[PDB]
Write an enzyme that holds these catalytic residues in place. Structure first.
Site: not given
Ligand SMILES: NC(=O)C1=CN([C@@H]2O[C@H](COP(=O)(O)OP(=O)(O)OC[C@H]3O[C@@H](n4cnc5c(N)ncnc54)[C@H](O)[C@@H]3O)[C@@H](O)[C@H]2O)C=CC1
Ligand SMILES: NC(=O)C1=CN([C@@H]2O[C@H](COP(=O)(O)OP(=O)(O)OC[C@H]3O[C@@H](n4cnc5c(N)ncnc54)[C@H](O)[C@@H]3O)[C@@H](O)[C@H]2O)C=CC1
Ligand SMILES: NC(=O)C1=CN([C@@H]2O[C@H](COP(=O)(O)OP(=O)(O)OC[C@H]3O[C@@H](n4cnc5c(N)ncnc54)[C@H](O)[C@@H]3O)[C@@H](O)[C@H]2O)C=CC1
Ligand SMILES: NC(=O)C1=CN([C@@H]2O[C@H](COP(=O)(O)OP(=O)(O)OC[C@H]3O[C@@H](n4cnc5c(N)ncnc54)[C@H](O)[C@@H]3O)[C@@H](O)[C@H]2O)C=CC1
Ligand SMILES: CNCCNC(=O)CN(CC(=O)N(C)N1Cc2ccccc2C1)c1cc(Cl)ccc1Oc1ccc(Cl)cc1
Ligand SMILES: CNCCNC(=O)CN(CC(=O)N(C)N1Cc2ccccc2C1)c1cc(Cl)ccc1Oc1ccc(Cl)cc1
Ligand SMILES: CNCCNC(=O)CN(CC(=O)N(C)N1Cc2ccccc2C1)c1cc(Cl)ccc1Oc1ccc(Cl)cc1
Ligand SMILES: CNCCNC(=O)CN(CC(=O)N(C)N1Cc2ccccc2C1)c1cc(Cl)ccc1Oc1ccc(Cl)cc1
Lengths: 429, 429, 429, 429
Positions: B52, B192
């Protein structure tokens, strides 16, 4: 030969009551009885066990017999035996040779009494510490070929089995349950998280909130201690040598510094490193007045208690396992359990539920080796994960936890069995 | 051949600004630069990376260049590129082929533009997903012999390498950092834990406290989510198929039940299982009005979004990545990120610090394979523990954590080097 | 005369959708409608309200009308109005004069438009800030005798009403809901606990865990901020001038020191003192590079932003309400919302549920004054506790909380009513 | 007249040792000694105190003497006396009449022995329960005119003073410290938060984590208990009759339901309501086997222990203050402290630090009435806030908290003195 040998077998009733209360907190063992009292998977087994003869242990012993095994027992420590628990077992007709306050000779003798059963020598070893395993390999090798397996649940024992295997000494397959998740998590993290504050309170009844508690080490023991303390309003400071463990602590918001620095700020000191020389004279000399110092890690090598004895100008015993030393600088240090395990000396050790997890592991190991010899070559083996999962599952009921069940479609998708294992070997949880 | 290809090279200043800010949050990578810029450990290396093309990745890229390596890049996802980040990299004189909104042909085309450097083909692969690894093995086998090593940080990539190796297709030594502690904890748990609520908030700005949050799964993602939620004052309910994870949740005081049951009580639903069919239509029909449903686990197989599209009476878009469905029973379901990752569609993904741990792991792997080829035969290798600890240590300075150093006496006592590894391979942390 | 006056009344549909979503998060207001849409306790009331024309506020407005009252509205801030919310209200046939970006003159004009209704002047004042109350007393005293009551929910407003009463200026009975528990707890503690990290993340997306967050002040705002931050893994440091508040912080395990000391250690700074000169140049000059600095207390007087502007050698805008100053020492400071409220400038303000508690208080006050004039002499009165309890009770349903009900025997024993109040006036909760 | 009367004066050394340790945990009182020993603010005062003759009380006593006051003491409960503590006080030359196990006649006799000093009758009353206050008003009205003031720290005592004042019986100015923040928070919330689990552990040594704890009431005791329990990993369920408290619990993520419902789910039950009939037989018949039931609220009216005694099939004593009842349904209930305060019967009561806050409040009250009679007409007066802050400040030194001091500019800005009060009378903290 003696059928047993306990302090006072008249303590059996008291012991029986304790066991009936403990049984409710040890669902994993009870679940085993409910599932195997009929199929009796241990039938033919002659299990010689060497484990602290406590109430919890008694429940483990009677679980094995219910599973069809012949059992003879001895403690693995000369002071760990809870006589009313030993009595109960003796009274039940199970050869148990243990009592609080044994001498080294008696201790050794007790283990020897468990070697031969009514119809022959043991054929299974359930050890805790490796003593039973070393006694056989060193003094009774003639019995090794007749022994089908060994289950060990301690670091020492496992470390020992590895040396034996490395030296070609080990002759029996051994299953190590020390490293199973259910065993380690409860025995290290949860167990100590439950008892630390318990030991400190019974010893000093001091207020935790508002105090700075320095916890040397951030492994499972350290993690649980830190969590417990934080839960009471204490500002926990962590010390660590492992960058990974230290980082974990930092991610929880715990300050991580050195003992050399924290000794000047902590009100309470807890060692969980399993290493020597954690708290020393130079640390003591820097501590605040009445700083509480205790160890919950390795035997008694973490705190330099000898320094305190040789340098303090005062030593006042406040109550059993609680001593208050005065230093040349006038400040006092409150040492717990004489530098030994605070949760043992100032509390009742691990809760029954914790012991249930460790022992349900021993049971699993025993069944696995006894019924699947063909699967284990001489050597040290980890407890199969499916068995480790079986242990946790055995405790879910008591917790009234509804475990979800993977549908066939989900299992195929995940590439696993509806019954597990659900995690690869390297999974850390 | 284009020296690069990015949306608008004029976004470089902006990208450069973002990187500067990011650097302070990625000490692990900056530590590598400070410690290796002078020695150029990656000198001679021609690294092709498929990851990415984000601001965080940009920092990793420049770190690789600082260490002496030549670098050519492409994103591993057609949408993950942050144009300003790619612009900065392109302006720095690094061949980067990536932009947000690529097509499948362009995506493939971008990876291809990285295989050949000004003075020759690549000799090192830094992958995230195994695309670059597959492209070469399948379409450019001729380039395989001149590639010294591969480093992979994703589960898919690693599993792939395993199938490859199993089938004799893998021709280059590879290092798996996906399973290193620093990478996994930050990439799964910490990552997360920082973004879940951030995503839910941006999407709805709803009050978390007082709500019942049902978190399906209690792995690292579940643990992190349950923790975040609990920290905000929400009563967290856990669903699990693994008895060990379920037991862990129970030990933290989380009620653990089945979705079939919790679906009638949750105000918020979060799936982190990595499994399919977690939240089905029969659950939806039971949910309270305006229940927020989101997935932070596996791409989009966890929530049956297709059922919603085919059964709702309404599907109203509230804002990008936030859809309010109205059902036949008249109640509405607020679906986030269309059933995809909530922290990606409703937030800014993982914090820079988290990515730093993943990427610093990549640097470690690159340096290892390039400098110590001899130590890695063709196959999938775990990042040595000593390096995983180095990744963690590299981040301790920023946190301003002061690690303790074992004395020779302590190290000898512990049977380990003063510099680690400090833990055995099976340690779970 | 204009029937209303909003930015773009075509935003009504969008506004209506927002209100329908907000209604679910504002159970207290909805509970009022369900309980009074028939008895219409506000019948005959002409409520002129001056409160931020937002979505939440719109729900409050329509709640009043449902209760039988005639309502005309204006914002209490020239930028607080959410045009699609104002449109919706206008479209509903309720005279609302507000829009984002008003000038001081328009602002004043908007409040004046709400004074006279179809059949006469207002007879009730629902204020937030005191502007509406001052406008009437200063410019329209002719209307005071026709006004039956005033409800105020802000510190400023209440402080102002006290001066007015102290100076014999106040001519209308006023009920202060600023100090009700349901209002204060949500508006100060819960509200800010929900938004702080939200504002900081949207502005920087920085990782919270592992960072030192210094929170100046430990009142309700400070308490909530500290709790939020701690929940993310941040090591929270508190500063305080009140020994009582400081002690509370110490009992939660928070280090409590001075800004002069913490400025050298904090990564994140949050001010919640409501006092001036909290963070100054001497503090900034000591901060770590990229220390995030923000205020969530009083308007913009807590941080010396002017110093930053006059002393920084750089000022780079990262994104709206996020600026990065570089200091002569080379270190950068990341200032949020330009020193103003971070939860307003970098987030969406308080969650709807929080606003529901404040407004359900306004409703209660309005009903109390309108229907029980005889009970309130001119002067400032606290909202009766039974009414404050009614507010909390109105929110229990949404939370699916089953409140227990005292038996007649228990009430007699406790010497209280089955319906309350359940606590004496001095009770602190 | 006996110079004192204690169990065994030979326990003085032991008592002295306990006090020395206690002093370090009672900084508030020690701060008073350091700050007032030289000025003797209580000079001329003849203080008669009726307060549990504990180690903590002993420290309070000597503090009073250090401040120049003459002191004569008696316990306010026939069982609350710690003989070694009383022994130390007696040996110090202070007339103390108290011992564990008094009779009703002796109790009364002990208070009477404190009314007259060597050179005259008392002139100051320090009470805990209102006994001493009542004894004098009813049996020694003749001594009332020479008594300058009264200080009361209990709810019963305060309510009593109110009835008295209401009926014109109160003849001496009294100061209520029961409602001061420092006293109430520590005596209700912090105090119980430290001992609840300590009591449950000593009584059962049960594992807290994983258990469902039902806490009836969410006042300060409930808040503290729920917090303690949650910190240990137990899922806490709250029952409440007050919507505000219930809402607060819901905001912290606690499921709030009725006992009628939770009785079927709790593993542990804790009543903190201060109300009768909390846990009835119909609840018992629903509890899980071996449910632990305890009261930390009002003496013994919360749990229907009488029902157990009249309906159980068995009542087996497990150990002092721990009784296991077996019911007709075959399940057993583990009742602690016979339905009385668990932290008293199964623990060591409040930590010394907690008591320090209560007692330092007493000293403050004593000093106030003795030095500023003019400021207190006959009636019940709240301890002025400035003194409550002083109590808190007195404890900040030990916690090593560094309070911030307002600058003149800040104080003038805030409209308060640099020395406080810093908060209005209605502030809830
Ligand atoms: N008291 C009890 O009931 C129990 C005691 N233990 C004992 O506690 C000890 C540690 O147990 P675990 O937490 O499971 O082990 P662990 O290996 O998980 O934790 C030990 C930690 O201490 C750290 N450490 C080592 N030397 C250090 C030093 N010099 N300074 C700062 N940190 C240092 C290590 O990096 C490691 O992370 C062992 O000796 C173990 O046998 C284990 C379970 C229960
Ligand atoms: N959104 C993000 O930024 C991230 C997403 N992930 C993804 O999240 C997923 C899970 O990752 P981890 O938490 O690391 O894995 P894990 O293996 O630690 O956790 C998965 C857990 O879900 C449980 N589970 C599986 N099926 C279930 C079912 N049907 N019902 C209830 N529980 C069930 C398993 O027992 C397991 O413990 C993966 O697909 C992973 O790739 C991982 C990191 C970050
Ligand atoms: N941003 C938002 O959405 C909200 C902002 N507020 C504002 O925040 C401010 C404070 O609100 P509350 O927490 O309710 O007030 P509070 O009075 O409960 O808290 C203020 C605290 O700051 C402490 N303090 C004062 N000066 C200090 C100093 N110089 N150094 C260190 N500590 C100091 C005080 O002792 C006090 O405890 C007010 O101006 C209030 O209007 C209130 C609610 C929401
Ligand atoms: N054990 C100890 O060491 C201590 C005991 N106490 C005693 O504990 C009791 C309560 O004290 P606090 O917590 O300060 O009072 P509080 O008024 O703050 O808390 C009592 C709470 O119980 C709730 N309640 C009353 N009846 C209820 C019912 N029937 N069902 C469910 N909830 C109900 C009330 O709404 C109230 O919020 C008092 O009797 C007090 O004297 C106080 C301090 C220490
Ligand atoms: C009364 N309940 C007793 C439960 N305990 C047992 O059965 C056996 N245990 C286990 C235990 O409780 N702990 C805390 N272990 C775990 C551990 C791991 C590694 C190193 C040291 C330790 C100490 C145990 C272990 C050791 Cl070394 C010594 C005594 C032991 O038993 C007792 C016996 C009586 C009492 Cl009053 C307390 C404990
Ligand atoms: C702006 N900050 C970007 C930081 N992120 C990155 O650099 C690359 N990341 C990592 C990431 O942030 N997450 C949350 N991953 C971890 C993971 C593990 C396993 C499966 C799925 C995921 C999702 C990443 C991964 C994926 Cl699949 C898609 C996009 C990604 O980057 C961005 C780009 C722009 C924005 Cl506005 C947000 C994120
Ligand atoms: C979109 N939801 C908006 C909810 N907010 C409102 O309705 C009105 N509010 C309340 C509010 O959200 N906060 C955070 N207050 C509480 C407070 C107490 C004391 C001092 C300052 C403050 C700031 C409010 C107050 C102020 Cl000063 C300015 C704007 C306000 O409204 C908005 C409007 C749009 C947006 Cl995008 C965010 C907020
Ligand atoms: C050994 N440490 C003793 C500290 N305690 C004291 O000094 C006096 N206290 C206070 C106390 O510890 N608690 C828990 N109170 C607070 C309270 C408020 C309202 C209603 C009931 C209570 C119970 C106290 C109160 C009562 Cl009713 C009975 C005994 C008391 O003292 C002792 C004495 C010996 C022991 Cl082994 C434990 C406690």
């Amino acid at each position: 030969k003696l059928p047993y040998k306990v302090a006072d077998i008249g303590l059996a009733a008291w012991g029986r009551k304790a066991l009936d209360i403990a049984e409710n907190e040890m669902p994993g063992l009870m679940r085993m009885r409910e599932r195997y009292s009929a199929s009796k998977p241990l039938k033919g087994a002659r299990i010689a066990g060497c484990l602290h003869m406590t109430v919890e242990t008694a429940v483990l012993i009677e679980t094995l017999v219910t599973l069809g095994a012949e059992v003879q027992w001895s403690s693995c420590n000369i002071f760990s035996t809870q006589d009313h628990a030993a009595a109960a077992i003796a009274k039940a007709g199970i050869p148990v040779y243990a009592w609080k306050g044994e001498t080294d000779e008696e201790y050794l003798w007790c283990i020897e009494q468990t070697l031969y059963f009514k119809d022959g020598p043991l054929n299974m070893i359930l050890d805790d510490g490796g003593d039973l395993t070393n006694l056989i390999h060193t003094k009774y090798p003639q019995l090794l070929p007749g022994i089908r397996g060994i289950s060990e649940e301690t670091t020492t024992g496992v470390h020992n089995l590895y040396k034996m295997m490395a030296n070609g000494i080990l002759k029996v397959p051994a299953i190590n349950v020390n490293d199973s998740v259910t065993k380690s998590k409860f025995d290290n993290l949860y167990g100590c998280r439950e008892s630390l504050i318990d030991g400190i309170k019974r010893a000093t009844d001091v207020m935790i909130a508002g105090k700075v508690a320095v916890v040397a080490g951030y492994g499972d023991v350290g993690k649980g201690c830190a969590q417990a303390l934080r839960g009471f309003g204490a500002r926990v400071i962590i010390t660590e040598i492992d960058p990974i463990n230290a980082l974990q602590a930092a991610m929880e918001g715990y300050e991580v510094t050195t003992m050399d620095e924290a000794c000047q700020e902590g009100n309470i000191f807890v060692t969980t490193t399993g290493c020597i020389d954690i708290i020393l004279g130079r640390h003591f000399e820097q501590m605040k007045d009445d700083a509480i110092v205790c160890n919950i890690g390795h035997f008694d090598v973490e705190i330099d208690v000898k320094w305190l004895n040789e340098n303090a100008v005062e030593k006042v015993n406040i109550k059993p396992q609680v001593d208050r030393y005065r230093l040349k600088n006038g400040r006092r240090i409150i040492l717990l359990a004489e530098g030994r395990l605070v949760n043992l000396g100032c509390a009742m050790g691990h809760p029954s539920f914790v012991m249930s997890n460790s022992f349900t592991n021993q049971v699993m190991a025993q069944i696995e080796l006894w019924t699947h010899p063909d699967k284990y070559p001489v050597g040290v083996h980890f407890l199969p994960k499916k068995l480790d999962e079986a242990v946790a599952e055995a405790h879910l009921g008591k917790l009234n936890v509804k475990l979800t069940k993977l549908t066939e479609k989900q299992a195929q998708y995940l590439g696993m069995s509806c019954d597990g294992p659900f995690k690869p070997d390297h999974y850390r949880y």
